[PDB]
């Protein structure tokens, strides 16, 4: 029932190569719906999901202007931070920004986020109360003082509790066939002789949405942690996700093992057995 909207921005400086590379993406839950790339020729925010293409020219002009502003402030920030930490001009550095909002099963506001990292390390972040900042070091403390003097957190809170959640609800309505759907996984088993006395059972979950899922093995009903192997959930490339879990078993004992599959799109968990 819960839902999320997130914007991710990354700026990487390119010393001796001109302007920093800037890439912005927007997600609703696990579905990307917008993208911007300073290297692309269009210089505009672009649709990545079908339900967002409905928006008219005012939407796209506004989002392009906003993402360009973010690009510009990030490019200023790269130099600002080089100064803060007294770093040379010859190396590459990375600024990342993320913000967004979470709503509950009733689509009411639940959480807000606004975070900055420098060189893969936390720099500054809006605290959970949406009223104050946490700073990772002294440079971030200068940023925090500047933002407190400008009352940034109040404007940010008004954005997160209004525009962010309101347009998330709009997207969830318009993209209902995509965002509000739960594709239960398509599961199957493969079997492979590893040696003349051992076998591998692999349990596949495919084409599920959203990405959260649980695969567990058990032997005669007892959870089987050891002799197993699971891969991280991975995108299929078409908006769905994949995962598998495998266990090595004595040949002739495959019937004792069961693969259990938990997913939101399943009314009850699935149980798969080889024989």
């Amino acid at each position: 029932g819960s839902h999320s909207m997130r914007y991710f921005y990354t700026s990487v400086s390119r010393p001796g190569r001109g302007e920093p590379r800037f890439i912005a993406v927007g997600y609703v839950d696990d579905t990307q719906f917008v993208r911007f790339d300073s290297d692309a020729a269009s210089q505009r925010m672009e649709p990545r999901a079908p339900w967002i293409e409905q928006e008219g020219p005012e939407y796209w002009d506004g989002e392009t202007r906003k993402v360009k502003a973010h690009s510009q402030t990030h490019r200023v920030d790269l130099g600002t931070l080089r100064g803060y930490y007294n770093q040379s001009e010859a190396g590459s550095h990375t600024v990342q920004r993320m913000y967004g909002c979470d709503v509950g099963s009733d689509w009411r506001f639940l959480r807000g986020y606004h975070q900055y990292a420098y060189d893969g390390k936390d720099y500054i972040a809006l605290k959970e109360d949406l009223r104050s900042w946490t700073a990772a070091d002294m440079a971030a403390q200068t940023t925090k003082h500047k933002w407190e003097a400008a009352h940034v957190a109040e404007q940010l809170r008004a954005y997160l509790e209004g525009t962010c959640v309101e347009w998330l609800r709009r997207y969830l309505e318009n993209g209902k066939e995509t965002l509000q759907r739960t594709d239960a996984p398509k599961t199957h088993m493969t079997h492979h002789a590893v040696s003349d006395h051992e076998a591998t059972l692999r349990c596949w979950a495919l084409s599920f949405y959203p990405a959260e899922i649980t695969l567990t093995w058990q032997r005669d009903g007892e959870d089987q942690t050891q002799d197993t192997e699971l891969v991280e959930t991975r995108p299929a490339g078409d908006g769905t996700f994949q995962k598998w879990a495998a266990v090595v078993v004595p040949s002739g004992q495959e019937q004792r093992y069961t693969c259990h599959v938990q997913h939101e799109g399943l009314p009850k968990p699935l149980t798969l057995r080889w024989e």
Binding site: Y7, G26, Y59, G62, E63, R65, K66, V67, A69, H70, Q72, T73, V76, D77, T80, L81, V95, Y99, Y116, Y123, I124, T143, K146, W147, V152, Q155, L156, Y159, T163, C164, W167
Partner: peptide
């Protein structure tokens, strides 16, 4: 949609 901000670190 995004936040219309010119926020500098």
């Amino acid at each position: 949609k995004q936040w219309l901000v010119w926020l500098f670190l």
